Write a protein that binds this ligand. Sequence first.
Ligand SMILES: *[C@@H]1O[C@H](CO)[C@@H](O[C@@H]2O[C@H](CO)[C@@H](O[C@@H]3O[C@H](CO)[C@@H](O)[C@H](O)[C@@H]3O)[C@H](O)[C@H]2NC(C)=O)[C@H](O)[C@H]1NC(C)=O
Ligand SMILES: *[C@@H]1O[C@H](CO)[C@@H](O)[C@H](O)[C@H]1NC(C)=O
Ligand SMILES: *[C@@H]1O[C@H](CO)[C@@H](O)[C@H](O)[C@H]1NC(C)=O
Lengths: 328, 219
Amino acid sequence: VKLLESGGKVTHEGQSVTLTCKASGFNFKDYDMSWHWSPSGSNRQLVASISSKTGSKTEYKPRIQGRAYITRNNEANTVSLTLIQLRKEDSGIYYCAKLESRYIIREQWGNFGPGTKLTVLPLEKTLLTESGGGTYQAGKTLSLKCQTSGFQFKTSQLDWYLWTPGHAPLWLTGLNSSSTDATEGRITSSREDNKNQIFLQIEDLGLRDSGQYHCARRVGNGDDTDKLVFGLGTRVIVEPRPQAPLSPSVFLVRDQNAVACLIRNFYPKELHVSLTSSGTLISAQNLTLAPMATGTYSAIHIGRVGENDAITCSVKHLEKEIHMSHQA
Amino acid sequence: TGVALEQRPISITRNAKQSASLNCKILNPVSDYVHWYRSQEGRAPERLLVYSRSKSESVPDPGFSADKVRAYKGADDTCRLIVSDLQVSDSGVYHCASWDGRVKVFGEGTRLIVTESAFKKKPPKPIFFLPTSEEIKQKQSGTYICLLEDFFPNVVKTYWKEDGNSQPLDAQFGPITGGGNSYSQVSWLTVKEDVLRKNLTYFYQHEDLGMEPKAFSIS
Ligand SMILES: *[C@@H]1O[C@H](CO)[C@@H](O[C@@H]2O[C@H](CO)[C@@H](O[C@@H]3O[C@H](CO)[C@@H](O)[C@H](O)[C@@H]3O)[C@H](O)[C@H]2NC(C)=O)[C@H](O)[C@H]1NC(C)=O
Ligand SMILES: *[C@@H]1O[C@H](CO)[C@@H](O)[C@H](O)[C@H]1NC(C)=O
Ligand SMILES: *[C@@H]1O[C@H](CO)[C@@H](O)[C@H](O)[C@H]1NC(C)=O
């Protein structure tokens, strides 16, 4: 009639899962129930079967013999639960069936449902915990650290990779079972064999050095099929170093449909910009602030107005005050 | 080094249960293998599969099934990753990678966007701002500004070049702002007096443009 299995989730290797199956529309006591498993599609295999009305004959398959337990709730429910030996290969679609003749043979188990999606993900024994992220002034020295766990640290190859949005992941430096690798000058790496830690040291920090730093471990068979196992990484933002307060240069551009207010070479980064047409604010205006390699900030305030209109860009970046106006 | 990975296009947008194909052109290949790593927001980057060239064999990593991710041969130097029956949980940045001895080289990546919503995919509309004489006077330098507005999806790649130098200039890019079906990005480039009055060119790559970039000539 209507069998609806409801269990399964996204768990990790070495977890527990309990699968339920609501059976509606027939006398639950008389008939026996069972659970099936299919890797991705068809080829359903009988993995568990329970007898009639909280029966006495519950038989498991050698696949889950010692980590399974099937039970039934006579209020329209059947439960199968897998123990903490739950690996990744016993993951897929599980179905719920009900048993349902001399010269006419039928299929022993029937009335399957849509199944339930159980996805067990593998659990990595390689643990990498990056620390040392934050905001740094330019010219300072960055020093990152990784706590490693779950592998032979002494004979392992561990690297530092720089992940920045829109850019290709870039290898900075690393270590192996030998002496310093690319460990001369700005980008440097070291290790502490006692606490199983690897370090990164970048000197004379620049704006280009911002990004997400991951320490990575090379695992595999030693050939080009090896993979890199990454940690969550730690984020590093670089700010301009403190310097003398510099007032900005303001300019005004047009493109017959928009207005760009150009604010160049100011410090600190705190300012207020506003674009006015006739004493009022213009339709749209969004600010974009960015620090230059010269050590100061620049900003652009774009808006849209007509070409035969008056507009005024007002810039307040200290005690000082600046107004740029184009008449009609 | 010398190894170079090229991934076109920069972004792929699909609805659920559809399929997606990602390309990886390898120039000067040292390793016989192409690795496909995935970057998802919040979790560490991990490898999906390793494709063997000359064997045309895709070996997925534990946790990924061959009926979900599988690499093939594209052109005579392209590795083609196909991700089928897309769910929202497939969204991420897919990078191809190759070993070069002890160092591993990655591509800039391809963002896969899988949404349960209908989308429009509109191309960027650029407006430019040329340097003013006042700036060249009181700063001895000119600033070019380009505003890409009202594009979807929110993935664009822009760069500036100088006519004859095959290396993009150092410009400033703002974040990709916007929402829904309209995103925008601003970028500006400041050049000196001795670099002014030299024909510039501006490029931007978007999903709604294909694999070739759109070019703009500036003077
Ligand atoms: C352990 O790490 C060290 C340092 O990374 C490795 O030594 C380095 O190996 C690379 C190649 O694997 C050498 O660079 C090569 O130079 C040639 C000539 O320019 C170039 O054609 C290659 O593409 C490559 O760049 C490098 O000289 C060498 N030494 C360094 C960097 O100090 C070592 O192989 C690693 N493995 C061990 C020791 O088992
Ligand atoms: C400013 O942001 C709004 C957000 O809706 C956008 O519509 C507008 O186009 C942006 N301004 C410009 C000049 O693109
Ligand atoms: C720059 O473009 C102009 C187009 O008016 C052309 O006459 C000039 O030759 C170009 N410059 C160079 C160096 O080719």
